[PDB]
Ligand binder design. Structure first.
Ligand SMILES: O=C(O)c1cc(C(=O)O)c2c(n1)C(=O)C(=O)c1cc(C(=O)O)[nH]c1-2
Ligand code: NA
Ligand code: NA
Length: 298
């Protein structure tokens, strides 16, 4: 038949809808078999993608644009409009981004992470502040940062959205999302920065498997939005034995299901991208002059 290899992170949310696709036979319904490939982290996943070891991974539009500008035929399809969480201790003095000055701030994904680019752009626009000049920045994978924020070695951490529900149950508050930043910028609607990244070669030679997987994913998300009972089936993959954590993860996932046409998604991405590569012409590191051509999957 046709096998589609999806690379997934152990702390990621893509494994949730992948389990729905398999359980409900939404891959079979689309003429393919989904093979979930477990990758240990984003660095390994990006290499697996560069090495052609998977047909797709989940990633961000800014990384996708960078691979496209670097010559790759990668295509992007919206995965979620829920992205990023700046977590501070409950009761923290920190009410604004200026309060990060002097703080040990964890930043998931490194200096070029999309959530960090957004947050740095916001701090420059609203306070004329370069967070890298005032905060003690510690980059790292989200699990490590969340643990060290819990242990008190970090004063704050910019993490993936799922880590909010988890930390709220342990004494932490989400001060700001990447979605909050893009609304402050003025985006027309919910912007999907997180998407499926499809291998150019798979798009060219197995385009119907790509479309079959895209349909299977949309059907899985639709099932989770329409069938509350299905969430209890996928709970083991969510690391959510705590009830408030399980409920918050569901709420934030549902709020992020993409529900706008690709044309509108593309135009918002184009404008937010063009607004990032600015901030007093700071040519923010990680951001190219413009999006590479034909990045979005039709
Ligand atoms: O910024 C975010 O909140 C966020 C969330 C998630 C997610 O939903 O797991 C991913 C990412 N970012 C991300 O950048 C990424 O590459 C990624 C991969 C996966 C996955 O499940 O395999 N999730 C995510
Ligand atoms: Na590619
Ligand atoms: Na379908």
């Amino acid at each position: 038949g046709e096998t589609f290899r999806l690379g997934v992170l152990p702390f990621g949310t893509a494994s949730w809808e992948a389990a729905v696709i398999k359980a409900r036979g939404f891959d079979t319904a689309n003429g393919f078999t989904l093979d979930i490939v477990k990758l240990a982290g984003n660095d390994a996943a990006r290499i697996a993608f560069l090495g052609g070891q998977v047909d797709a991974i989940v990633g961000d539009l800014i990384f996708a644009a960078r691979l496209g500008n670097e010559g790759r035929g990668v295509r992007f399809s919206p995965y979620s409009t829920t992205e990023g969480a700046l977590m501070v201790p409950a009761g923290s003095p920190i009410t604004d981004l200026k309060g990060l000055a002097g703080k040990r701030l964890g930043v998931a994904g490194g200096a070029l992470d999309k959530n960090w680019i957004l947050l740095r752009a916001q701090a420059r626009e609203t306070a004329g502040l370069e967070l890298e000049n005032v905060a003690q920045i510690a980059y790292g994978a989200p699990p490590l940062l969340a643990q060290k924020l819990e242990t008190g070695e970090l004063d704050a951490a910019l993490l993936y959205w799922q880590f909010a529900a988890r930390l709220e149950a342990k004494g932490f508050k989400r001060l700001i999302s990447a979605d909050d930043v893009m609304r402050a910028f003025g985006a027309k609607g919910a912007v999907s920065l997180i998407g499926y990244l499809y291998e150019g070669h798979t798009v060219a030679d197995r385009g119907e498997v790509v479309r079959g997987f895209a349909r299977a994913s949309a059907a899985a998300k639709d099932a989770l939005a329409n069938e509350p009972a299905l969430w209890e089936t996928v709970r083991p993959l969510m690391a959510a034995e705590d009830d408030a954590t399980f409920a918050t993860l569901k709420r934030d996932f549902l709020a992020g299901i993409p529900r706008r046409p690709i044309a509108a998604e593309r135009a918002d991405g184009e404008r937010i991208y063009a607004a990032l590569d600015r901030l007093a012409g700071a040519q923010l590191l990680g951001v190219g002059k413009s999006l590479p051509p034909d990045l979005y999957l039709d």
